[PDB]
Design a binder for this molecule. Structure first.
Ligand SMILES: CCCCCCCCO[C@@H]1O[C@H](CO)[C@@H](O)[C@H](O)[C@H]1O
Lengths: 48, 443
């Protein structure tokens, strides 16, 4: 019924590893760029 | 009489040191008129949270009279001899100088010494100046250019001493005590940290003599003759944005940390800034100006003006640019500006540096146009390089600079660096830090 059974699962293995790795790297990059806004501070200094 | 020859024939700058540690330098010419003053290595950087703006407060009383002679007397005497009395206080340097007839070089030296040593600090005059300084802070608050540079330092050196403004805080100005100013003067206006400089038609030996006579009060301990090394100020890549769409034009300043006085690279950074140059809507040259950025500014009407700068300090500095533009042309201006900075690190030409070198030479020669400016050079040089640097040396250094050297030095201080940004006024069009940071590489 599914001659590709084994190969399918070997791919799933790599898919999972690459995914873990890639998701983490991209999570960091997203956080890195967004740090600018995330820690940003502001104040309202109206005149006299 | 060639450029080279004229440079070699310039009278040398004489320096001698008194036992108290004070240095006396002067360049002699044949002018009936002269300028002499005392350049002190003091400023806001030496102050702290409690006495910030004291050096400025002092600069306000340094001319309102001494102990030997009250206000009116001090003023009348100086005025009646046709002499000019000016001075200033910055972050790392202060100065009090006088312009007059060489015929009075000695009386002046006595006057200077009296100012730096016996300031009256009239209790009543202090409360009077407290209100004056408060009026100047409101006047200067409308000087976008200076508000912008203050902010640039406030963020670029946040957390440190160079972050404070020279004039100081409102709270400090409202609470500085007669004792604080007194303390300031005593702690900082000290012989080893000062320089008596003079230029014009004056005898170096006659200068040094009057100097020995009035600049005395020698020190006993070792803590009195040592020049305190200041704690390092950390540079921070960041931005401060003060938005007010009610302002007509926007000011923007971007900068990276510079090397500091003593570094030879500064000769190259100045050549670099010479390539980019500066501009303002009244430069007849127009669309033909050599400075690419300036040309674009004209073609696309990118700004009202822009200027480059390499502000040095003892251990650090600020290398960047500043422009003024309409709210709707900020983005293109910043784009072209950062673009030119990339071109520097990457594609500078020999022709480019050739021109910039010439421009830089006549620039240094122009800073010695008069007694005061030359006297200013001396005070600063000894105070920063601990020695005068002749135009011939500069020229020697400037001549060695080539395109490759410009690219390497610029790449060193600019390429892929996190800059310090200060924007004031109608700045909605100026893109975010991240986008600007990306303008720091490739391109
Ligand atoms: C389910 C029966 C599987 C028999 C084949 C065993 C080999 C499984 O392995 C996979 O087979 C694929 C195709 O054969 C190849 O393209 C893959 O590179 C290989 O890893």
């Amino acid at each position: 019924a599914e001659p590709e059974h084994d190969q399918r699962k070997r791919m799933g293995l790599k898919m999972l590893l690459i995914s873990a790795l890639l998701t983490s790297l991209l999570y960091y990059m997203k956080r890195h760029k967004w740090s600018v806004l995330k820690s940003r501070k502001m104040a309202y200094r109206p005149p006299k | 009489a060639t450029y080279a020859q004229t440079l070699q024939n310039i009278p040398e700058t004489n320096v001698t040191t008194l036992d108290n540690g004070l240095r006396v330098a002067s360049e002699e010419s044949s002018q009936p008129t002269c300028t002499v003053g005392v350049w002190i290595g003091a400023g806001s950087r030496y102050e702290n949270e409690k006495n910030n703006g004291a050096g400025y407060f002092v600069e306000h009383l340094a001319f309102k009279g001494t102990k030997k002679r009250p206000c009116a007397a001090f003023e009348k005497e100086v005025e009646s001899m046709g002499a000019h009395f000016n001075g200033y206080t910055s972050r790392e340097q202060t100065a009090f100088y006088i312009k007059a007839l060489s015929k009075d070089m000695p009386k002046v030296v006595e006057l200077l010494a009296d100012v730096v040593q016996n300031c009256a600090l009239e209790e009543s005059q202090i409360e009077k100046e407290r209100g004056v300084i408060l009026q100047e802070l409101k006047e200067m608050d409308n000087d976008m250019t200076n508000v912008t540079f203050d902010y640039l330092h406030a963020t670029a050196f946040q957390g440190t001493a160079l972050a404070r403004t020279v004039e100081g805080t409102t709270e400090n100005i409202k609470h500085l005590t007669r004792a604080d100013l007194a303390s300031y003067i005593d702690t900082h206006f000290k012989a080893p940290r000062m320089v008596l400089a003079a230029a014009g038609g004056i005898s170096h030996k006659e200068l040094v003599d009057a100097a020995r006579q009035h600049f005395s009060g020698v020190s006993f301990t070792y803590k009195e003759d040592a020049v305190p090394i200041l704690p390092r100020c950390r540079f921070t890549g960041s931005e401060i944005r003060a938005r007010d769409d009610a302002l007509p034009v926007a000011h923007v300043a971007l900068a990276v940390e510079g090397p500091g006085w003593a570094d030879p690279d500064n000769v190259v950074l100045h050549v670099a800034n010479a390539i980019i140059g500066r501009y303002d809507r009244t430069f007849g040259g127009g669309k033909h100006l050599s400075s690419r950025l300036a040309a674009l500014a004209v073609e696309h009407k990118l700004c009202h003006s822009f200027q480059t700068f390499n502000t040095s300090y003892s251990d650090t500095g600020l290398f960047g640019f500043h422009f003024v533009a309409d709210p709707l042309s900020i983005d293109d201006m910043m784009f072209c500006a950062q673009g030119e900075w990339m071109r520097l690190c990457t594609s500078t030409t020999e022709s480019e540096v050739k021109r910039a070198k010439n421009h830089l030479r006549s620039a240094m020669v122009a800073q010695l146009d008069g007694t005061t400016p030359v006297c200013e050079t001396i005070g600063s040089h000894l105070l920063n390089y601990g020695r005068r640097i002749s135009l011939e040396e500069w020229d020697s250094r400037i001549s060695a600079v080539d395109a490759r050297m410009v690219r390497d030095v610029c790449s060193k201080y600019i390429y892929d660096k996190c800059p310090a940004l200060a924007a004031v006024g109608p700045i909605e069009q100026l893109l975010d830090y991240n986008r600007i940071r990306s303008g720091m590489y490739w391109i």
